[PDB]
Amino acid sequence: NSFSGYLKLTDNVYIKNADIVEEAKKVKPTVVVNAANVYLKHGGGVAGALNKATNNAMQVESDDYIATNGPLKVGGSCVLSGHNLAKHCLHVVGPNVNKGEDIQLLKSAYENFNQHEVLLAPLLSAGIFGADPIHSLRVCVDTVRTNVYLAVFDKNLYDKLVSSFL
Ligand SMILES: O=C(O)C1=C(c2ccc3cnccc3c2)CCC1
- CATH number at 98 reads 3.40.220.10
Residue range of the domain that includes 140: 1-165
Question: In the PDB record, what is the listed experimental method?
Answer: X-ray
Atom of ligand 1 nearest to the CA of 21: 12
Sign of CA dihedral 76, 81, 83, 85: positive
Q: Residue 97 corresponds to which amino acid?
A: V
Helices (H), 2-132: 20-27, 45-53, 57-69, 105-111
User: Domain total for the chain?
Assistant: 1
Whole-angstrom distance, CA of residue 121 vs CA of residue 141: 13
* 116: helix, strand or coil: coil
Residue closest via CA to ligand 1's atom 7 equals: 45
Sheet with 77-81, strands from edge to edge, namely 7-8, 13-17, 147-152, 118-121, 31-36, 88-93, 77-81
3-state DSSP assignment of residue 58 = helix
Whether 161 lines ligand 1, by a CB cut-off of 6 Å, is no
**Resolution expressed in Å:** 1.3
Specify which residues 80 forms β-bridges with: 89
- Residue spans of beta strands (DSSP E) within the chain: 7-8, 13-17, 31-36, 77-81, 88-93, 118-121, 147-152
- Residue among 24, 27, 56 nearest 42 (CA): 56
